[PDB]
Amino acid sequence: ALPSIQLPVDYNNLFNEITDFLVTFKQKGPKYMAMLQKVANRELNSVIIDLDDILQYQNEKFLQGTQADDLVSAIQQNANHFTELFCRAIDNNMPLPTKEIDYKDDVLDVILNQRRLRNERMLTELFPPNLTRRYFLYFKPLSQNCARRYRKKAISSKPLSVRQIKGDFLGQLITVRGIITRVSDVKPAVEVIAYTCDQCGYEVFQEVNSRTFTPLSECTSEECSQNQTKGQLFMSTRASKFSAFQECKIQELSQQVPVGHIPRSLNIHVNGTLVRSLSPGDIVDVTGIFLPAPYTGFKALKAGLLTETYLEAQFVRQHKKKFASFSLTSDVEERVMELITSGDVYNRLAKSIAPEIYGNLDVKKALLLLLVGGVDKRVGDGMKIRGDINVCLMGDPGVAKSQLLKAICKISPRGVYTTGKGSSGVGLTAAVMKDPVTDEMILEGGALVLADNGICCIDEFDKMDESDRTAIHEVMEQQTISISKAGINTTLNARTSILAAANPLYGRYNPRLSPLDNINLPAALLSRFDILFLMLDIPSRDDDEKLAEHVTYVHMHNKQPDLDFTPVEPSKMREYIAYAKTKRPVMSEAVNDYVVQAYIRLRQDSKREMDSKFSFGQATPRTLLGIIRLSQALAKLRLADMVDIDDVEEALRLVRVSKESLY
Amino acid sequence: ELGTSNLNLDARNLLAYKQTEDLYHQLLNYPQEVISIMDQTIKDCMVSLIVDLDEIETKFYKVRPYNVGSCKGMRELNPNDIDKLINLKGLVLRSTPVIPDMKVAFFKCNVCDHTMAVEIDRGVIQEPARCERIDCNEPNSMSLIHNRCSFADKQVIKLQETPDFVPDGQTPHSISLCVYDELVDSCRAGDRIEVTGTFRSIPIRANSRQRVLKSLYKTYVDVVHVKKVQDLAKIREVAAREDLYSLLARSIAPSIYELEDVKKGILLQLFGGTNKTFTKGGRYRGDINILLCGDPSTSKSQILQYVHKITPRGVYTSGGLTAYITRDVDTKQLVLESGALVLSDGGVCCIDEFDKMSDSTRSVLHEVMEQQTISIAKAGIITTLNARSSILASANPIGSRYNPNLPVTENIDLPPPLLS
Ligand SMILES: Nc1ncnc2c1ncn2[C@@H]1O[C@H](COP(=O)(O)OP(=O)(O)OP(=O)(O)O)[C@@H](O)[C@H]1O
Ligand SMILES: Nc1ncnc2c1ncn2[C@@H]1O[C@H](COP(=O)(O)OP(=O)(O)O)[C@@H](O)[C@H]1O
Ligand SMILES: [Mg+2]
Ligand SMILES: [Zn+2]
Ligand SMILES: [Zn+2]
């Protein structure tokens, strides 16, 4: 039938050692009894085990010549068998509850009590342990300093790549690294299935571990062991046991892909309380069990020896970074105290954004004023006003406006970067279009990419087609997107700040009139924008000398040189921007007359806009609205809960600087 | 005294009493049986209170519990919440045709024409292996009749979570729904409703030719209650005033400064004219159409937005607007679909960016403004549809400004007949 072999392993001594470790461990008394007690009180719902304790305990008990073998080796060589051994050991040594229990809520225990008082009263069945366990069992990988403590190579860890996993690692405990791309929803998974046979005393229980099974039809009770059944049996949902289940796949990082290769993928199955501990788009270090998967689910009858593989999660390190929503703490409080003691802030922040690109101070000032946001939160009668600012960057190629845009996208959390073509899913379609394996046509209709309080960064604003242009006309002035195709009308609340860079259709500035040269853009869209700024390449000695010197000094040091002088840092800016947005000063009435007379002089300018030679001095109420928004942003970035007239003057000076670039 | 059959039941006032909270908790654990026994209690309360008894025996009784607990979301649904009553809010996306449900199986002993009615339970039918007539007593003479049975109406709704539950730009999800009887067609696409019903899980068949079942179950909910989200004398008292005209006109654009005459014109357009159908010469159009032109510094779209919600019926669009046959997306079938103009019958149809109208659609307008009827001849379908709608449109001049010396025609780049 089946030949036999001799192996050095024997599980009896391993089980005895496991029980001895669990009972006797000293790290409060013993730690593991401390966990198990609160488990008994129905307080802890999942148990996590560390093998560093096992290793150090075994090593320190090795000082007495009684131990003969080690456990972590066999743990590394095989895992699931040890999970069963651990659950058996826990159930043998389960403590009694030291606290009262809201005992009426456990409906499963009510059913169990009913069954016991039904069968034992007539003279009883041993219920399987899995039907009773309230706890999940999890393993944790070791740490490398613990391995350094001793001579032995108890290493594990070593976060292999996706392609570094071979067919020899099946059954072991291994650690992977990569970015999570897809996460499925949470669905219940069966563990024990309970039937009922129309009052057949004991009700049959069965367990299934495979991803498929078959049900029961006739029970084995004596009254149904009779030639005909005492009532047909049915599956009972309430009595059965379930566990939370989810499926995710991971993709290799670009850095680890060898040249001329395509990255591969790996599936992960997660169960228990660890479900929903990771989100798509993050770098993680996953430790799990590398298990095979039968191909019979495909039901192709081919691949007689070929089978698929998957990983079962055990312990996840989220890694990456936490946004924390500027949650207050003592350290951030003393940081903002330091910022207050710094005195004048905005100039340092502007200097500290992109030191790689030389000059262009006022562009960075406008970026500061864009990051805070304008006046918002509506007015009386419900009239709509938005705090978002629409600024368009304009200039010659080779001015590093795209690089500054990339720096802004890096420094902002909500920034989204777009450019001319390359894909068709950027706009007008949700990311979940025809995505599910069942093809459920999941969609929202008219929406953009994270347009709610996002920062739409666009490059080559004169490149996109008519569809994206229609979308960006529709996102105007916090207007929602309500495009319908199949009766869907769940509009996306489009409230985003627009920052786009476009290049002239001639590739250079022109001596003739600019509005006719323009950007090949509608005049209505141009008038929508709050601020228009220009970057004109002026051939000169005193500026090209400095630019070349800075670029070559950057090249020589291979870093950001000490030539830069910035007291404030990107994390510091990220903190202070949220801090300043939180303050949210309100509008001061007295600026009314000053802004009215400013708009009067702006209309006086419009009385001169037929002189031409540049026709951007148009008459538009949006000019005044943007003036007010920028003054509010200047009041928001600092100061008390008022609005200063100096903010209005600064906004007007910024507008003048934006306009004077025409010449 | 009404003859109705419905009993709304709140939980908070049910919680207000100290003995009732025990039944409250027992209801959360065991919804079906508690509700059934409550309905039987009301059935007996009929006689307990009337002491005509004829209307009582004919009508069933049901309850509509609500406000049982906090409204949860589809992002947090642990398997601990199986067979428990929950409160859900969301947006109805789609529907399905009503599905007959088997209740009373009809059978006929074909050899002896004998008929027997059989009840069912849990869907599965225990078929009679032999006809009761021992005179024939044949086992194989049992044949059922499809069209002489009794059926129950079932409708399945698809529900989406509210966008409030997705803060970081993720995607919403969908939970299937089930309704019975009075709740059928109580909702349709685009609605915002809140529901209260129990959870449920079902085994999935996998291969329909095999007995196996998958290790995972589909999640769906069964609901029992759904909520959404003589003054003519006062008119004449208002209608008797002398300055009703000016106040009524200025009352629809509170935020618009000046521009009184255009407001009066738009109000009169909203009121509309008279429509008559004398047969000696055919019907006469009774609708008013007004065009708006000027630089984009007047907030003219705000007026259209005002009138769109002020009007009873109306579709607000911009420069596809009429009927065109479409291929169904979720199902594989062909349906006739009507455009925005067809739906605006009797109301006001608002159009923006009229200059960017392309060219093919313009002719359609020339078809509808002169006859108020649109015909279609496509894919073997030839028919005519009625529009009878008013038109309000806005257009922009060409350039940074509209030159007063320049005549209107060239700056508005519309054909002379259409604007005439
Ligand atoms: N002020 C500057 N300081 C430093 N480097 C600069 C500066 N201006 C341009 N550069 C250099 O120019 C390049 C970036 O210009 P680039 O042409 O990519 O940007 P752009 O003006 O948005 O145009 P394009 O659409 O052609 O990319 C980089 O190599 C950068 O080092
Ligand atoms: N009389 C006014 N009262 C209030 N706001 C105005 C007025 N005139 C112009 N505006 C502002 O200027 C904008 C003018 O836009 P609009 O002329 O409607 O552009 P378009 O019609 O091309 O979309 C409006 O969004 C509004 O906020
Ligand atoms: Mg560029
Ligand atoms: Zn039975
Ligand atoms: Zn018969």
UniProtKB/Swiss-Prot annotation, chain A:
Domain MCM positions: 345-552
Sequence motif Arginine finger, residues: 527-530
Entry GO MF terms: ATP binding; ATP hydrolysis activity; chromatin binding; DNA replication origin binding; MCM complex binding; single-stranded DNA helicase activity
Swiss-Prot/TrEMBL keywords: ATP-binding, Cell cycle, Cytoplasm, DNA replication, DNA-binding, Helicase, Hydrolase, Nucleotide-binding, Nucleus, Phosphoprotein
EC id: 3.6.4.12
Gene Ontology cellular-component annotations: chromosome, telomeric region; CMG complex; cytoplasm; DNA replication preinitiation complex; MCM complex; MCM core complex; nuclear pre-replicative complex; nuclear replication fork
Compartment(s) of residence: Cytoplasm; Nucleus
GO BP: DNA replication; DNA replication initiation; DNA strand elongation involved in DNA replication; double-strand break repair via break-induced replication; nuclear DNA replication; pre-replicative complex assembly involved in nuclear cell cycle DNA replication; premeiotic DNA replication; silent mating-type cassette heterochromatin formation
Binding site for ATP 1: 358, 398, 400-402, 503
Residues engaged in binding ATP 2: 528, 622
Source domain of life: Eukaryota
SUPFAM superfamilies linked to this entry: Nucleic acid-binding proteins, P-loop containing nucleoside triphosphate hydrolases
Matching SMART domains: AAA, MCM
InterPro entries xrefs: AAA+_ATPase (IPR003593), MCM (IPR031327), MCM7 (IPR008050), MCM_CS (IPR018525), MCM_dom (IPR001208), MCM_lid (IPR041562), MCM_N (IPR027925), MCM_OB (IPR033762)
Reactions mediated catalytically: ATP + H2O = ADP + phosphate + H(+)
EC class: hydrolase
Family note: Belongs to the MCM family.
Described function: Acts as a component of the MCM2-7 complex (MCM complex) which is the putative replicative helicase essential for 'once per cell cycle' DNA replication initiation and elongation in eukaryotic cells. Core component of CDC45-MCM-GINS (CMG) helicase, the molecular machine that unwinds template DNA during replication, and around which the replisome is built.
Further comment found in the protein's record: Present with 166 molecules/cell in log phase SD medium. Early fractionation of eukaryotic MCM proteins yielded a variety of dimeric, trimeric and tetrameric complexes with unclear biological significance. Specifically a MCM467 subcomplex is shown to have in vitro helicase activity which is inhibited by the MCM2 subunit. The MCM2-7 hexamer is the proposed physiological active complex.
Self-association state and partner proteins as the record states: Component of the MCM2-7 complex. The complex forms a toroidal hexameric ring with the proposed subunit order MCM2-MCM6-MCM4-MCM7-MCM3-MCM5; loaded onto DNA, forms a head-head double hexamer. Interacts with CSM1 and MCM10.
Name of the featured protein: DNA replication licensing factor MCM7
Protein source organism: Saccharomyces cerevisiae (strain ATCC 204508 / S288c)
From Swiss-Prot, chain B:
Intracellular or extracellular location(s): Nucleus
Domain of life of the organism encoding this protein: Eukaryota
Disulphide bridges: none
Domain MCM: 244-420
UniProt: ATP binding residues: 294-301
Quaternary context: Component of the MCM2-7 complex. The complex forms a toroidal hexameric ring with the proposed subunit order MCM2-MCM6-MCM4-MCM7-MCM3-MCM5; loaded onto DNA, forms a head-head double hexamer.
Function: Acts as a component of the MCM2-7 complex (MCM complex) which is the putative replicative helicase essential for 'once per cell cycle' DNA replication initiation and elongation in eukaryotic cells. The active ATPase sites in the MCM2-7 ring are formed through the interaction surfaces of two neighboring subunits such that a critical structure of a conserved arginine finger motif is provided in trans relative to the ATP-binding site of the Walker A box of the adjacent subunit. The six ATPase active sites, however, are likely to contribute differentially to the complex helicase activity.
Additional remarks: Present with 8800 molecules/cell in log phase SD medium. Early fractionation of eukaryotic MCM proteins yielded a variety of dimeric, trimeric and tetrameric complexes with unclear biological significance. Specifically a MCM467 subcomplex is shown to have in vitro helicase activity which is inhibited by the MCM2 subunit. The MCM2-7 hexamer is the proposed physiological active complex.
Protein name from the UniProt record: DNA replication licensing factor MCM4
Species this chain originates from: Saccharomyces cerevisiae (strain ATCC 204508 / S288c)
Span of the entire protein shown here: 235 to 700 of 933
